[PDB]
Design a protein around this ligand. Structure first.
Ligand SMILES: *[C@@H]1CC(=O)N(C)C1=O
Ligand SMILES: [Cu+2]
Length: 106
């Protein structure tokens, strides 16, 4: 049971999440922190999550924009969640390919 931290906007000043791709075990915590070049948000698409479950995507996505620095959003992948690859993106910076992927390992 750990806690992974992802910065919304690279310290370099690029429009990415870092680390972009992550690998976690069930029970772990993911914490996005507002870093460089806000505003950001976190969206999963209908058919990017395991099973393409719309309700799932909408349960995880923080559709609301975050503006102040240090502002954070947390998801804990308890046993409740299925395994596979969850793919997410910042909506304002979709064009610039601000994209990340979390894989749930076994
Ligand atoms: C993406 C998946 C879907 O069916 N809708 C309505 C989306 O926004
Ligand atoms: Cu962004």
């Amino acid at each position: 049971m750990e806690t992974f931290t992802v910065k919304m906007g690279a310290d370099s000043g690029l429009l990415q999440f870092e680390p972009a791709n992550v690998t976690v075990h069930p029970g772990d915590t993911v914490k996005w922190v507002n870093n460089k070049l806000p505003p950001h948000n976190i969206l999963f698409d209908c058919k990017q999550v395991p099973g393409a479950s719309k309700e799932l995507a909408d349960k995880l996505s923080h559709s609301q924009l975050m503006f102040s620095p240090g502002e954070s959003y947390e998801i804990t992948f308890s046993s409740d969640f299925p395994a596979g690859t969850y793919t997410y993106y910042c909506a304002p910076h979709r064009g610039a390919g601000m994209v990340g992927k979390i894989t749930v390992e076994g």
